[PDB]
Amino acid sequence: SALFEPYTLKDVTLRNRIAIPPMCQYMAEDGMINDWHHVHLAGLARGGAGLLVVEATAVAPEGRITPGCAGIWSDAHAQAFVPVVQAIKAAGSVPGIQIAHAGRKASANRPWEGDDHIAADDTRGWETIAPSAIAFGAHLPKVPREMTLDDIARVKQDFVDAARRARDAGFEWIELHFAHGYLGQSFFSEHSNKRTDAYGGSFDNRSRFLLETLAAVREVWPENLPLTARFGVLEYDGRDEQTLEESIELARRFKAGGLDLLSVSVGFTIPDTNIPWGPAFMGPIAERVRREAKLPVTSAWGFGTPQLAEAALQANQLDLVSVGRAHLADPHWAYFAAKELGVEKASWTLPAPYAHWLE
Amino acid sequence: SALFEPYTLKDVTLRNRIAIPPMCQYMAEDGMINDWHHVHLAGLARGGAGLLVVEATAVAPEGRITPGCAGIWSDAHAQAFVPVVQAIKAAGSVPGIQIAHAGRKASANRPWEGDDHIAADDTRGWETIAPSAIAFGAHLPKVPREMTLDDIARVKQDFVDAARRARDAGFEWIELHFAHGYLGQSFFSEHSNKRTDAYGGSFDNRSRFLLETLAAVREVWPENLPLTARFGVLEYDGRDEQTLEESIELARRFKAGGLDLLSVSVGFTIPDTNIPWGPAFMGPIAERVRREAKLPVTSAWGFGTPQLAEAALQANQLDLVSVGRAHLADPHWAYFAAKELGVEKASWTLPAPYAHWLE
Numbered sequence A, B: 001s002a003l004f005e006p007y008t009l010k011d012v013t014l015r016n017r018i019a020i021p022p023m024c025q026y027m028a029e030d031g032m033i034n035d036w037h038h039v040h041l042a043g044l045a046r047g048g049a050g051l052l053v054v055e056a057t058a059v060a061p062e063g064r065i066t067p068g069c070a071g072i073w074s075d076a077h078a079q080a081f082v083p084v085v086q087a088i089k090a091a092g093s094v095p096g097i098q099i100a101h102a103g104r105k106a107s108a109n110r111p112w113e114g115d116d117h118i119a120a121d122d123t124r125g126w127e128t129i130a131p132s133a134i135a136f137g138a139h140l141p142k143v144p145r146e147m148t149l150d151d152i153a154r155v156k157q158d159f160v161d162a163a164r165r166a167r168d169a170g171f172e173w174i175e176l177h178f179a180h181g182y183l184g185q186s187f188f189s190e191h192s193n194k195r196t197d198a199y200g201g202s203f204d205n206r207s208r209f210l211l212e213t214l215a216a217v218r219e220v221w222p223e224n225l226p227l228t229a230r231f232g233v234l235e236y237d238g239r240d241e242q243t244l245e246e247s248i249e250l251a252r253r254f255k256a257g258g259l260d261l262l263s264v265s266v267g268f269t270i271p272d273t274n275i276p277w278g279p280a281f282m283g284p285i286a287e288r289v290r291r292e293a294k295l296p297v298t299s300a301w302g303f304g305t306p307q308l309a310e311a312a313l314q315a316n317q318l319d320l321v322s323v324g325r326a327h328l329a330d331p332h333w334a335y336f337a338a339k340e341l342g343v344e345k346a347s348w349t350l351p352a353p354y355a356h357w358l359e
């Protein structure tokens, strides 16, 4: 089966095409992860997936989405990942991490504690920053502080320092979080970037933040380790053909700048959208990005059944299939998939103490 | 549904009736557990089951089944359990442990490494002990050393110290392993026990080692925490009516001896047998032991589908349903079962960082 063929990219070889995408757990304290993350991630890696991408991890404290988000803005934070990365590799999966900055969507409650912007009288809240002082709206009404050129310079540096630490902690795959309406996405989008300087206005200008961050990170991230990014290529906002054409052009520019693979997603930059959720609904968009940008890709948001995952790969809509919620429901989803698709000795997708009994 | 009704025994309350029985992992080193076990067991506890019994943990080095078996025969071994017991409770599951001595079945290869007795010339092996110098046979041909009275007193004390240690590490539930052809089972069965002193021959003499071990453990095990045992009540060896009758009478004596719950199983004392494996096949036997000895019971060996487990509970064949291999396949099997049986808010069988996304 396609789903269980290995995948090599640079010096990294994943044992199958299943990737667990970054999924915030909101269980960290002041950016520090703890035994929640440790057991959660080592458990997922033992489950059989070829690649495990750690949740959005903030490059700087105001760049967390919530008070529960992970951070890697100091060496102490990075060191905390070391036992988890080792546990993931010992399980045979490839450890990756997504480094992030929530931009205007930051300073927010955990999704089960309101999901909304933290109240002004609430003591956990903080100032958010963004390309322009414009609120997302809806449940996220805080107006962000407008970034100056100096802020842009500092945040770029935090990304570089984050990538350096990720590298030293032993990650073998990095993902820049340029999606989901966070800082990078907000720089690209005209809905949120009304700047009149080198960073807003034209296409070149809106791409600039993202391209400069990619390039500053690329100087410190090893040439032989996959260097990837997540990016929301459309919004379902009524401007989809123009937005998609522009996003695919940015993807060609990421490729020109050494990006190795693109995780294709939705922008979620603004709330007034009409996203057509459904099984593998992202398949044709990812297929387009892949074919026109000529870059490997993955996507998510509906591929979490073994047959859908297998079809997307067979049709070359994706190179890796990212399966999120199914892995929360069942940490051994890879084994479930292998049994469904009639893989030989499917149970040895797991470690011997499980695989032996499940034959 | 009855599967998700809590269960109170002595001072302990289980959040539902799903128990994960002890399942050897063969991953320890000189009896010391490690990050295999910590992640395995914390992961299972977060899965939702009300009770998690740790695998057969040897009361002495020679009572390990294999070189990979967990031990609790020193304080250093018990210290190792401390952080994992707190991980299990933090997840809201009840930590239990099965303490054991493999008798003539010890000094064996891991199941994926031959599963037979360790060759004489292999230095990982050790001399085994049992009631009598008679081999199991088949894949376990080693003739064990016949135990002396000092051996019997020492092993009883090893069980007391193992209990004491288990208590002091914070376990809330203990299970004496008198099943599966290991030491305790092999004292009961006339197949394996040919002794002619106070410790074999009559019903009272074959029962003595098990009763005296229960009594000794009972002295150090707290009164307000459930004290239980697993016992093989028949062999499918052609002598079933007879064997089941004596076994239930022994269960009466355990009960008289302060046993709170009996894990009902098969003896596996000798290889020449005809076990009729099938879905819930132990159900009517567990029901009989429970009814006749007036002891709560659990059993296993085929209740691993949600309807079967629920049916056994409604029929009062069991008080708790143990689900073993299903949990190796899917550490979140409790959530799977809640969904299948239509529990309201079934996703909150899991902790918030999972439950939120899955409703």
Ligand SMILES: Cc1cc2c(cc1C)N(C[C@H](O)[C@H](O)[C@H](O)COP(=O)(O)O)c1[nH]c(=O)[nH]c(=O)c1N2
Pocket: A021, A022, A023, A024, A025, A055, A056, A098, A177, A179, A180, A230, A300, A301, A302, A303, A304, A322, A323, A324, A325, A326, B353, B357
């Ligand atoms: C609990 C949780 C955690 C988050 C996410 C999801 C969920 C459910 N997602 C989105 C995720 O990677 C994935 O794209 C979606 O879950 C859709 O894929 P599935 O349909 O679930 O397989 C996500 N994506 C991302 O880019 N960074 C992240 O940290 C987060 N956080």
Ligand SMILES: Cc1cc2c(cc1C)N(C[C@H](O)[C@H](O)[C@H](O)COP(=O)(O)O)c1[nH]c(=O)[nH]c(=O)c1N2
Pocket: A353, A357, B021, B022, B023, B024, B025, B055, B056, B098, B177, B179, B180, B230, B300, B301, B302, B303, B304, B322, B323, B324, B325, B326
């Ligand atoms: C890998 C593994 C590990 C072990 C076992 C099982 C398996 C598969 N079992 C037996 C187990 O507790 C249970 O009785 C059986 O798994 C049958 O129940 P299921 O049909 O699997 O739910 C077992 N039982 C026991 O009394 N002590 C133990 O340590 C073990 N070790």
